[PDB]
Amino acid sequence: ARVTVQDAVEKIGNRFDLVLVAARRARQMQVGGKDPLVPEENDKTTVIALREIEEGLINNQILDVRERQEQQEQEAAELQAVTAIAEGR
Amino acid sequence: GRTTDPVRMYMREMGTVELLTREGEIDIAKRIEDGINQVQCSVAEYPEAITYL
Amino acid sequence: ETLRVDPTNDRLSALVEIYRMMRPGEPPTREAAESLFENLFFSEDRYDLS
Amino acid sequence: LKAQTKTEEFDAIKIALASPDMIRSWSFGEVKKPETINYRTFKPERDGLFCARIFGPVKDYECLCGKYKRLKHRGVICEKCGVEVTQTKVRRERMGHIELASPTAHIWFLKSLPSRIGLLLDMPLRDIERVLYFESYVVIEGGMTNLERQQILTEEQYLDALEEFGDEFDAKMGAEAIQALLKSMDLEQECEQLREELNETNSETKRKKLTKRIKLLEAFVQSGNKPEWMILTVLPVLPPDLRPLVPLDGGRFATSDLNDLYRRVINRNNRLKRLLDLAAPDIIVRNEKRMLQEAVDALLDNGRRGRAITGSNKRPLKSLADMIKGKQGRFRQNLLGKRVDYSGRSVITVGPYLRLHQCGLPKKMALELFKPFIYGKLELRGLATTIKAAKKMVEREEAVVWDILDEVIREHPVLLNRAPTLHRLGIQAFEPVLIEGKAIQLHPLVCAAYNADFDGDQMAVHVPLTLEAQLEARALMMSTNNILSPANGEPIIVPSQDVVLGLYYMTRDCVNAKGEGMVLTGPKEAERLYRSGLASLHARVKVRITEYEKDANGELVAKTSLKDTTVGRAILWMIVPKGLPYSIVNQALGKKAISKMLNTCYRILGLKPTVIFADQIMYTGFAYAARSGASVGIDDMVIPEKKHEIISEAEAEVAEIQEQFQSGLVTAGERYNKVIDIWAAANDRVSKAMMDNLQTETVINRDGQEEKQVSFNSIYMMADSGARGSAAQIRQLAGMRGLMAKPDGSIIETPITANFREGLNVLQYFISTHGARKGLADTALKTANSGYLTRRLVDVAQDLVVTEDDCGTHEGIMMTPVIEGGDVKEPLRDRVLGRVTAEDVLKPGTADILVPRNTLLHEQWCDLLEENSVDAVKVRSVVSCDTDFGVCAHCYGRDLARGHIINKGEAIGVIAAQSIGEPGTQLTTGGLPRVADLFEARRPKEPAILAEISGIVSFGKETKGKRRLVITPVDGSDPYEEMIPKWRQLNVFEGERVERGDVISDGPEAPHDILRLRGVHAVTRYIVNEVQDVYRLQGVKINDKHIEVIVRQMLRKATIVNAGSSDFLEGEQVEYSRVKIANRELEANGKVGATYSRDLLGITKASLATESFISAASFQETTRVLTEAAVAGKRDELRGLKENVIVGRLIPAGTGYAYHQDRMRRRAAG
Ligand SMILES: [Mg+2]
Ligand SMILES: [Zn+2]
Ligand SMILES: [Zn+2]
């Protein structure tokens, strides 16, 4: 349980964008794409994400960056597959 | 003048027309006979009206 | 003064204004005004204070 | 890129008049028959109101005839009877039409108050209706002969005129007439001519109407609407499932009233076509056309002609207008309410064991509510093969499911709500705790926020579903996250009754008790002294304590000392966290003090410590109150021994004055006042007797013979602590109760001498009864008035949301202590707290800036201002904000349940409206109606008048009903002369100079005057001060902020004086206007910039203007709004709260503010 969110609100100012970012990360966990950055107490992804905000290891900057990397990580694989589509010409 | 409620603008509009005398009915009916028979005769005077039949 | 504002003159006239008050827009008739007005408060049928 | 054709996520919406071809575009067939269903086989009769061919298949993916039954054949149109086999849902969608024989007026555009067909043609309504009913002929395009274009003629007149002029003259009658008029109309030419006529003639009467009409016309042209469309050639038919025939039990059928209407329309239409093909006489086909008009009108909007009645049933039939409007005043199903899944409710109980962040949720309720989650969690762990088996399991309530429920419940919050939701705290998020029982358990400290008694009130639960909803509930609606009323920074979590009687009983001191005078090492052995029965809970004792002060830099200093305190205070001190001084617990701990403890704790240690603090306070309050053995007996209520004597003497006075009235020394009324006064004085005396006796009468001995202190009597402790009871009610218990008043309000001169501790006899009780019934009536009424008021408030505010960050204007209002007539009816510190400074402020000496330009003034800043003598601070406000279409957070203030500055995107208009509204039940010209009068800016009954301009004035002319006042400015021209009725006693001196806005008479003044002759800051100050007078007289705490945003919404529109872009006298947005003149001051015209005049609009009036028409159709009269918008071709972009609520997407505020913003910038851009 997280009794108060104030610390997370300290880590990202808006407190609405807190709900948004925490939601995004929470979905990164819930749909099984990724794993927690901090020990799971049986806390649901909802609270795990907030704990991740409090530790300052998760916010909009970090998330955007990581996603931007993964784009190229998929581009790396599919490079040889999609360049084979030169039949377009 | 007009209360609306179209029952009224009808009731008043028809109520202007005067009731026919017993003779007037026969005058009008005679007029009917005149007109119709005119169109019938006009039909009888057309060659194609015959040939078609 | 009430009379000074009264639009009517004679019984029949008043009855006309009343019948045209209760059932407005339709042409008033003598028997109609009489029947209505007699039937409002004066008829054993349509009126009782008991 | 190809933009798109088919489905996207749409923006805005558009409304306008409908072409016959458009109505046809929607129509997938023409319903030619009144028939509905076949009467045995219930299949739809083809081309009828209910039809398979035109609308859709009766059952899913199945042809009507039955040929193609397979889910394969889909885009197939059946050869037998063409029906494309598709889901029956498309019968809820596809429209239809009817081609009418004679043209027909659309009753909305004929009968809308400003009749559209009427004022577009400059043709009076009654004339047009006289034309539609075939009661007269009207000219069209008269040419040059004898006749006006719009002129109306009678039978004989039309005949004569026709005999004179065969051609070059034209006249029609009926619907075809009006349609021909509208079609023939050239708007542009009228525009030119009207511009000219506007220019030539000088009269106010002429050019007012002239300009109004030209503006109307050009707007209609710019719309894209062609006038002809107000006359219906084609009538669209609504989809069958939206007006269903669906069967019932007993084999009976039930259907919408639209079927009767549509049926009538189709009938009379077909019969008219028939009467045309039969060459009927005019008098017949005319009657038929009229009847068709009536039928169509009744279908669209019923009640503007005859109010047709449904078959065999007296009650009038519901039309499409009534379908749109709804009922319960203005409610559109997003308004009155909407039923919602994943919810529940039940009776509520206490649950003191709960932490403030949780609530007891009944087992069965949790099972049913979380049922889908449970299904998924059951088969995720593999305890259930498939979802079916999962259902079977939870239905069997197998042992294993409860644990799974404990799994899905843990971090998943639930929303709890009560019946009268006023302020946002009406809904709060809690962590569910599984409980055996059917009752919901709700944390005691929250009971104040809900205004929830335990007498059988119910609460409703809602399960937040999506992840975003869980996190919203936890980071926003969470209980622990709102500890402070949004109206004022004071804690709403303040301990209520039992708890405060506990803490009060705990720290208090009697004269002599076990362990008196001794000394102890610390709170530990103090509590140990108490629990062992050696020392009494309350005794004067010195004990060593260790307190802390964070007063170092971010750091907690330690200091120890021997304090003179009691045992109870020592015990209680164990709870108080860290940096709080022992000073706070060393008092008697009343409700106010016990609240300020919490407040200080929050403004020092932060949130979490304050939370857990409040929790412990509750626990200890309950426990120790329980230990205390507080009770109430019949002997706990002490009547003054001197009561009967006071009664007797005061009863002697009445016989004195009675003797005088008998002898005639005094008049009857004067007598009345005298006796009433002596009895009132009597009641005061008895009250102030029983209060002394009840309060101080404990007389108790320490080592000597006697000493006396404040009473330990139960009822006194209860009344004194602030737990429950009050001097008035206690006065009603022991002392005599009041003097009653007849419904007239003439106060009875024989007061109730007896009290509740004694008996009341027959008469006394009967007289009390009226007071009771009027009490219940008045309160239950003021609830309704409160609701109505809040409603007007959110209607006028709503879409106002924090948008920009900082507009950065030095502008703001001067904040002084209220200082009324006595000493300080409210300090400076409260008024300026949490408010940003407009500019830097000074010590008595200078070049020393204490507070530096714009800075949130928190408790420390305000105390720093308090150390210095500063009486004056200029403060930025929401009313003065330079930002257009919203408020910048920098202007607003910090206020929220959190002490930090207001977030970007929080919707402030709503919370302001709520904050003003919720206390409204507690308000008693004065009063809540006075509040309403203020916000409606109503000119009072007997208003004063303020000097129009400064300078020496004198009196002129005579006695015409106004004796004119002539003002004489020093340098400027005199001619301002106002007509003052002389029958009103004046003030202004005939020989003295009077500043603009001085008192030329007495009585209250209309805020319009204050706005014009004094100005914006002056008027906002008047409103806020008067309404705050009303509230504060009742002991209601409301920050000036909310009232100031309401005020800002009131003055939103203003009228222009000068010119160079838009029209002269128009009332318009000062946002639009100011952004236009700020843009005009440079570039554009070098400066053409116009001058406006700020206007004051009442809240109910200002709510009328809203850009979005969907929004307006909600709370206003729907029928008018839809028409009025449709003629202008108004395009609603949403952009507001209400509209997005209706259309069902994310609110352009809060969490959604990130969405709507990101989309807002994408719009009007690349
Ligand atoms: Mg109650
Ligand atoms: Zn078929
Ligand atoms: Zn601002």
Query: What is the DSSP annotation of D522-553?
Result: SHHHHHHHHHTTSS-SS-EEEEEEEEEETBTT
Q: Which residues are within 8 A (CB) of D1002 and not within 5 positions of it... i.e. 6 or more apart?
A: D944, D985, D987
∠D665-D669-D671 over CA atoms, to 5°?
A: 50
Tokens of D601: 């704790």
- Chain D residues within 8 A of A50 when measuring between CB atoms: 471, 474-475
Contact predicate D965/D955, CB 8 Å? yes
- The span from the CA of D364 to the CA of D359, in Å, is 15
The sign of the torsion formed by the CA atoms of D441, D444, D448, D452 equals positive
Range list of H helices, D722-834: 727-733, 762-796, 828-832
Tokens of D177: 């007439």
Task: Verify whether the Cβ–Cβ distance A15 to D607 is below 8 Å.
Answer: no
Q: Tell me the residue type at D740.
A: M
- Chain D residues within 8 A of A45 when measuring between CB atoms: 467
Nearest to D1094 by CA among D1064, D1051, D1136: D1051
DSSP letter for D48, please. Answer: B
Range list of H helices, D918-971: 928-935
D510 annotated as a binding-site residue: no
Contact predicate D210/D60, CB 8 Å? no
Contact predicate D1120/D113, CB 8 Å? yes
Q: Looking at chain D, which residue has its C-alpha nearest residue A49? A: D471
Nearest to D1069 by CA among D1043, D1088, D1095: D1095
Q: Tell me the residue type at B34.
A: D
Q: Is D1104 exposed, middle or buried (0-12, 13-18, 19+ CB in 10 A)?
A: middle
Task: Verify whether the Cβ–Cβ distance D468 to A45 is below 8 Å.
Answer: no
- Chain D residues within 8 A of A43 when measuring between CB atoms: 410-411
Contact predicate D595/D499, CB 8 Å? no
- The span from the CA of D472 to the CA of A18, in Å, is 9
**Three-state secondary structure of D657-726:** HHHHHHHCCCCHHHHHHHHHHHHHHHHHHHHHHHHHHHHHCEEECCCCCCEEECCCCHHHHHHHHCCCCC
Separation in Å, CA D851 to CA D814, D854, D868, D875:
16, 8, 12, 12
What are the structural domains, with CATH classification, of chain A? Answer: 1-89 (3.90.940.10)
Contact predicate D1010/D1018, CB 8 Å? yes
How was this structure obtained?
Answer: X-ray
Separation in Å, CA D410 to CA A3, D360, D413, D1002:
12, 13, 8, 66
Q: Looking at chain A, which residue has its C-alpha nearest residue D467? A: A23
- The span from the CA of D591 to the CA of D721, in Å, is 6
DSSP letter for D244, please. Answer: -
The sign of the torsion formed by the CA atoms of D751, D756, D758, D760 equals positive
Nearest to D517 by CA among D498, D533, D540: D540
Bridge partners of D555, per DSSP, are D551
Whether CATH 1.10.132.30 fits D634-782: yes
Q: Which residues are within 8 A (CB) of D128 and not within 5 positions of it... i.e. 6 or more apart?
A: D110, D115, D117, D118, D121, D178
Contact predicate D130/D137, CB 8 Å? no
Separation in Å, CA D1128 to CA C45, D226, D352, D1053, D1125:
58, 11, 60, 21, 5
Q: Which CATH architecture has domain D1099-1165?
A: Orthogonal Bundle (1.10)
- The span from the CA of D13 to the CA of D1131, in Å, is 6
- The span from the CA of D989 to the CA of D981, in Å, is 16
Phi, psi of D290 (to 5 degrees): -60, -50
Distance between C25 CA and the closest CA of chain B, angstroms: 5
Breaks (C-N over 2.5 A) in chain C follow: none
The helix (run of H) or strand (run of E) holding residue D120 is helix D116-120
Q: Helix A45-54 crosses helix D467-475 at what angle (to 10 degrees)?
A: 50
The helix (run of H) or strand (run of E) holding residue A3 is none
Contact predicate D1089/D1081, CB 8 Å? yes
D891 annotated as a binding-site residue: yes
State the distance between the two ends of chain B, measured CA to CA, in whole angstroms.
Answer: 57
Contact predicate D280/D300, CB 8 Å? no
Nearest to D442 by CA among D479, D481, D491, D492: D479
Contact predicate D491/D897, CB 8 Å? no
The tokens 């068709």 sit on which residue? Answer: D292
Task: Verify whether the Cβ–Cβ distance D480 to A3 is below 8 Å.
Answer: yes
- The span from the CA of D421 to the CA of D415, in Å, is 13
- The span from the CA of D1016 to the CA of D1022, in Å, is 10
Q: What is the DSSP string of D958-981?
A: --SS-EEEEE--SSS----EEEE-
- The span from the CA of D977 to the CA of D668, in Å, is 49
SS3 content of chain A, % helix, strand, coil (to 5): 65, 0, 35
Range list of H helices, D805-907: 828-832, 859-867, 889-892
**Three-state secondary structure of chain B:** CCCCCCHHHHHHHHCCCCCCCHHHHHHHHHHHHHHHHHHHHHHHCCHHHHHHC
Q: Which of D356, D357, D433, D474 to mutate to test the interface with A (most CBs of A within 10 A)?
A: D474
Q: Which residues are within 8 A (CB) of D1078 and not within 5 positions of it... i.e. 6 or more apart?
A: none
Tokens of D932: 């309403």
Q: Count how many pairs of residues, chain A against chain D, have C-beta atoms within 8 Å.
A: 83
The angstrom resolution of this structure is 3.7
DSSP letter for A87, please. Answer: G
- The span from the CA of D472 to the CA of D97, in Å, is 47
Q: How much distance in Å is there from the Cα of D889 to the middle of ligand 3?
A: 7
Q: Which residues are within 8 A (CB) of D652 and not within 5 positions of it... i.e. 6 or more apart?
A: none
Tokens of D1157: 């913003």
- The span from the CA of D480 to the CA of D491, in Å, is 12
Distance of CA D368 to the CA centre of its chain: 34
Task: Verify whether the Cβ–Cβ distance A14 to D903 is below 8 Å.
Answer: yes
Bridge partners of D427, per DSSP, are D417
Q: Report every protein residue that has its C-beta within 5 angstroms of ion ligand 2.
A: D 63, 65, 67, 78, 80-81
- The span from the CA of D1110 to the CA of D1105, in Å, is 12
Nearest to D498 by CA among D730, D727, D723, D729: D723
D862 annotated as a binding-site residue: no
Separation in Å, CA D583 to CA A24, D563, D589:
47, 10, 11
The sign of the torsion formed by the CA atoms of D392, D397, D400, D404 equals positive
- The span from the CA of D883 to the CA of D811, in Å, is 12
Bridge partners of D542, per DSSP, are D519, D564
- The span from the CA of D594 to the CA of D616, in Å, is 13
- The span from the CA of D1013 to the CA of D138, in Å, is 53
Task: Verify whether the Cβ–Cβ distance B6 to D286 is below 8 Å.
Answer: no
Nearest to D592 by CA among D712, D488, D503, D682: D503
Tokens of D996: 């603009």
Residue D834: helix, strand or coil by DSSP?
coil
Q: How much distance in Å is there from the Cα of D1019 to the middle of ligand 3?
A: 19
Q: Looking at chain C, which residue has its C-alpha nearest residue B15? A: C27
Distance of CA D832 to the CA centre of its chain: 26
Q: Tell me the residue type at D222.
A: Q
State the distance between the two ends of chain C, measured CA to CA, in whole angstroms.
Answer: 35
Q: Which of C20, C21, C23, C26 to mutate to test the interface with B (most CBs of B within 10 A)?
A: C26
Nearest to D298 by CA among D260, D330, D339, D354: D260
Distance between D839 CA and the closest CA of chain A, angstroms: 25
Residue D547: helix, strand or coil by DSSP?
strand
∠D137-D142-D148 over CA atoms, to 5°?
A: 75
- The span from the CA of D711 to the CA of D709, in Å, is 6
- The span from the CA of D969 to the CA of D694, in Å, is 67
Q: How much distance in Å is there from the Cα of D924 to the middle of ligand 1?
A: 20
Contact predicate D965/D956, CB 8 Å? yes
Q: Looking at chain B, which residue has its C-alpha nearest residue D133? A: B9
Phi, psi of A25 (to 5 degrees): -65, -45
Distance between B3 CA and the closest CA of chain C, angstroms: 5
- If phi > 0 it is left, if psi is from -120 to 50 it is alpha, else beta; for residue D538 that is beta
CB atoms within 10 A of CB D961: 8
Phi, psi of D963 (to 5 degrees): -100, 110
D447 annotated as a binding-site residue: no
Tokens of D238: 């609504």
- The span from the CA of D1008 to the CA of D975, in Å, is 22
Tokens of A59: 């916010």
Contact predicate D427/D415, CB 8 Å? yes
Phi, psi of D1068 (to 5 degrees): -155, 165
Radius of gyration of chain B measured on its C-alpha atoms: 20
Tokens of D1090: 């116009």
Tokens of D741: 């008043």
- The span from the CA of B33 to the CA of D1086, in Å, is 88
Tokens of D312: 């065999």
- The span from the CA of D1123 to the CA of D410, in Å, is 52
Q: Looking at chain B, which residue has its C-alpha nearest residue D134? A: B9
- Do β-strands D95-105 and D27-30 pair in parallel, antiparallel, or remain unpaired? parallel
Tokens of D695: 């309060």
The sign of the torsion formed by the CA atoms of D1026, D1030, D1035, D1041 equals negative
- Do β-strands D137-139 and D95-105 pair in parallel, antiparallel, or remain unpaired? unpaired
- The span from the CA of D351 to the CA of D364, in Å, is 18
DSSP letter for D480, please. Answer: T
Give the one of D135, D293, D306 whose C-beta lies nearest to B5's C-beta.
D306
Radius of gyration of chain D measured on its C-alpha atoms: 38
- The span from the CA of D706 to the CA of D715, in Å, is 24
Q: Looking at chain D, which residue has its C-alpha nearest residue B7? A: D287
Q: Which residues are within 8 A (CB) of D843 and not within 5 positions of it... i.e. 6 or more apart?
A: D850, D868, D870
CB atoms within 10 A of CB D135: 20
- Chain D residues within 8 A of B5 when measuring between CB atoms: 305-306
- The span from the CA of D537 to the CA of D530, in Å, is 6
Separation in Å, CA D573 to CA D582, D585, D590, D616:
7, 7, 16, 11
Nearest ligand by distance to the CA of D85? 2
Contact predicate A10/A49, CB 8 Å? no
Contact predicate D936/D1098, CB 8 Å? yes
Give all strands of the β-sheet with D1067-1069 in edge-to-edge order: D1067-1069, D1053-1056, D1092-1094
Q: Does B6 touch chain D (CB under 8 A)?
A: yes
The tokens 């790396």 sit on which residue? Answer: A76
Separation in Å, CA D132 to CA D103, D174, D276, D520, D1047:
10, 4, 19, 101, 48
Q: Does B16 touch chain C (CB under 8 A)?
A: no
- The span from the CA of D776 to the CA of D598, in Å, is 35
- Do β-strands D137-139 and D152-153 pair in parallel, antiparallel, or remain unpaired? antiparallel
Bridge partners of D946, per DSSP, are D999
Separation in Å, CA C47 to CA C14, C24, D64, D503, D572:
21, 22, 61, 75, 82
Residue D464: helix, strand or coil by DSSP?
coil
Q: Tell me the residue type at B41.
A: C
Sequence-separated contacts (24+) of C5-10 with Cβ below 8 Å: none
User: Could you tell me which chains touch chain D, where touching means 3 or more CB pairs under 8 A?
Assistant: A, B
Within 13 A of D422's CA, how many CA atoms are on the CB side?
Answer: 24
The helix (run of H) or strand (run of E) holding residue D190 is helix D187-200
Tokens of D930: 């006075």
- Chain C residues within 8 A of B2 when measuring between CB atoms: 25
